[PDB]
Ligand binder design. Structure first.
Ligand SMILES: Nc1ncnc2c1ncn2[C@@H]1O[C@H](COP(=O)(O)OP(=O)(O)O)[C@@H](O)[C@H]1O
Ligand code: BEF
Lengths: 68, 52
């Protein structure tokens, strides 16, 4: 679960561990809040989760991102 | 009688096709660079002048 997929400009420590936690939640079929404080790149962690799941859990589905 | 199911062309995704479509999306990123650079807005000149 701590592994980057087809992605560029790789993560720093907490972002990589967060990617690991996110795909761990996905694997246990859980849903989560990444309540990381601002600037920890929770966008980038989510993008990396997108990539990881796309390459490793079959194929990508249409993830919908609803944002301000 | 006038049925239209459109079951034809039942296209599906595959892992070999995955990297090909990723390849064209990498080219789409390269194209995005042309959106990342910028040019100017092309402002316009003043109105025509009266002469009676
Ligand atoms: N791991 C990272 N490596 C390189 N640049 C990053 C990283 N995380 C964030 N950045 C840059 O810093 C900015 C902050 O990321 P951001 O998406 O605002 O994080 P958050 O939304 O969680 O505050 C982004 O615009 C991004 O370009
Ligand atoms: F953590 Be952020 F501001 F998306």
């Amino acid at each position: 679960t701590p592994i980057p997929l087809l992605l560029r400009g790789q993560l720093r420590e907490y972002q990589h561990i967060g990617l690991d936690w996110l795909v761990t939640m996905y694997e246990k079929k859980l849903n989560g809040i990444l309540a990381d404080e601002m600037g920890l790149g929770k966008t980038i962690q989510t993008i990396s989760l997108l990539a990881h799941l796309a390459c490793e859990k079959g194929n990508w589905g249409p993830h919908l991102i609803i944002v301000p | 009688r006038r049925k239209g199911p459109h079951c034809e062309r039942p296209l599906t995704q595959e892992e070999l096709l995955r990297e090909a479509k990723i390849t064209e999306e990498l080219n789409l990123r390269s194209l995005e660079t042309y959106e990342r650079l910028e040019a100017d807005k092309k402002k316009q000149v003043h109105k025509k002048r009266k002469c009676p």
